[PDB]
């Protein structure tokens, strides 16, 4: 009662960066560029065992496996032992977010990493995460399921673990899931008291470099979609925002960054086309309106769906990050084949 699973997936990205900063060639444009690219392939092993109680120990053990050769390691992808029952779920271990797992009904496109922004909707993305972490995940009632996660300090934290000189980076994710009749209503966010953002938003971990603290971090993100009857519509809102905590005058000062995206995808027979318009807003960072962290993104394509483990995918995308005036827009399409076993 141990699977072994994954999805292989790869193709090749053709992609396209105008930035007048990086690139001086004719009009800003990069030379496009065409590379084999892994999606994120993945291998994983998981299992199941009754416990008779109508309980279940349930673990995970899953790795990225680009087939590109690019990866090592094991458990670097969600993976966990846990106890499920009647009373629900609690893993522990390296876990998605609340966030990671609401961004299934966010981002659909596969790509490799480096298109990962403009061929998907990673922007959008950037809150999820694995965290090393518990989490609880309600048994579904009503069509009502929710997730608590937390990440213990000293796990945000290990070096800091005996002594704690650094405010707790502890984070509470916590997802509130409504699935009526192929309609989604998802709420999904973390709440860091403190926690980290590198330059593009991401959350990282202290005394990585560059990062820059924050305090009341947390995200937002409402879900709300339709997936039945071969038509896919999802509208995500997301809310991110923190005061800044590093040591200094902005301290205190509002980081605030709005993003909607929005995902149309119809299946006709085999083939489902989709775009997704993902818009993040001008952010404030320090409390200042920021359209460098503005963003607009368009993707269409599709996935031919040769059976139900196997896909071809062509996408194509357009994005354009910043104002005009320092303005990087990303051009990238893909094919791409993907099989999940
Ligand atoms: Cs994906
Ligand atoms: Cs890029
Ligand atoms: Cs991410
Ligand atoms: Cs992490």
Redesign the pocket.
């Given at each position: 009662q141990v699977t072994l699973y994954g999805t292989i997936k790869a193709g090749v990205e053709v992609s396209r960066v105008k930035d007048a900063g990086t690139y001086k060639a004719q009009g800003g444009k990069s030379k496009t560029a065409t590379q084999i690219a892994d999606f994120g392939s993945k291998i994983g092993f998981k299992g199941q065992e009754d416990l008779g109680n109508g309980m279940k120990a349930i673990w995970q053990l899953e790795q990225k496996a680009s087939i590109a050769g690019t990866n090592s390691g094991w458990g670097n992808r969600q993976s966990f032992i846990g106890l499920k029952g009647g009373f629900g779920t609690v893993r522990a271990g390296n876990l998605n977010t609340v966030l990671?797992d609401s961004?299934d009904n966010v981002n659909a496109w596969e790509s490799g990493s480096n298109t990962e922004d403009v061929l998907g909707l990673?922007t959008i993305?950037?809150?999820?995460?694995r965290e090393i972490s518990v989490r609880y995940d309600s048994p579904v009632f009503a069509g009502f399921s929710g997730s608590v996660q937390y990440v213990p300090r000293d796990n945000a934290n290990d070096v800091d673990k005996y002594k704690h000189t650094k405010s707790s980076r502890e984070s509470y994710h916590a997802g509130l899931k409504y699935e009526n009749a192929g309609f989604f209503g998802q709420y999904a966010g973390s709440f860091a008291k403190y926690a980290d953002l590198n330059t593009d938003a991401?959350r990282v971990a202290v005394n990585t470099a560059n990062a820059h603290p924050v305090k009341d971090y947390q995200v937002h993100r409402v879900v709300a979609g339709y997936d039945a009857n071969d038509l896919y519509v999802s509208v995500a809102g997301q809310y991110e925002a923190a005061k800044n905590n590093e040591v200094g005058s902005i301290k205190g000062k509002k980081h605030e960054q709005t993003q909607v995206a929005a995902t149309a995808a119809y299946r006709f027979g085999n083939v489902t086309p989709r775009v997704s318009y993902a818009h993040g807003f001008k952010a404030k960072v320090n409390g200042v309106k920021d359209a460098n962290y503005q963003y607009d993104q368009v993707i269409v394509g599709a996935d031919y769906d040769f059976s139900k483990r196997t896909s071809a995918l062509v996408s194509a995308g357009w994005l354009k990050q910043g104002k005009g005036a320092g303005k990087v827009e990303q051009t990238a399409s893909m094919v791409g084949l993907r099989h999940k076993f």
């Open positions: 990671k961004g990673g993305g950037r809150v999820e995460s991401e």
